[PDB]
């Protein structure tokens, strides 16, 4: 079970570092969309539940990339990874 407290996310790099800790990603985790795909399909433990709270605050960040991160989770689920996504 992994929680992203969107109110506390200050940048896309912060988002990747939080995912790294919450999902126990490898120390070498590349903090990019290709690294995230690889970790979600060939590293993480299942069943995986990601609760992303206040995704809307990520959208307010100057950097783009919030929807792209969510999209990788959704594509990994579509690929067959046992992932559940909660947008709260």
């Amino acid at each position: 079970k992994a929680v992203i407290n969107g109110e506390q996310i200050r940048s896309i790099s912060d988002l990747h570092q939080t995912l790294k800790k919450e999902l126990a990603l490898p120390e070498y985790y590349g903090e990019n969309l290709d690294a995230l795909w690889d970790a979600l399909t060939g590293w993480v433990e299942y069943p995986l539940v990601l609760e992303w709270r206040q995704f809307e605050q990520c959208k307010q960040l100057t950097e783009n990339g919030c929807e792209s991160v969510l999209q990788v989770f959704r594509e990994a689920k579509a690929e067959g990874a046992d992932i559940t996504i909660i947008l709260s």
Partner: protein, 108 residues
Amino acid sequence: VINTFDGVADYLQTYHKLPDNYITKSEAQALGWVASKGNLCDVAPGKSIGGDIFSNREGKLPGKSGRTWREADINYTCGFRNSDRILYSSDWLIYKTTDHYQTFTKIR
């Protein structure tokens, strides 16, 4: 096994397929692979993950609509997966990453 950057690159350029010691994520899962248990060699001894479509999500590799990219693990000898990958296109460009897809370098 053939599992080094130059080993797999040379083999790909010569035979237009990965060496026999590669299996895709889905094929591995069908055999009982559980990535979080690091158990690929228990269900497929001597194998490495490779051959899956690589979607080039950061756009770092040169792309065009008629070109498909694929990826394969490099330097894997069982256990948890590492940070090393070879990337190869349908027109036989070959790149490598040693930093979990952060940077790529052309090798063929």
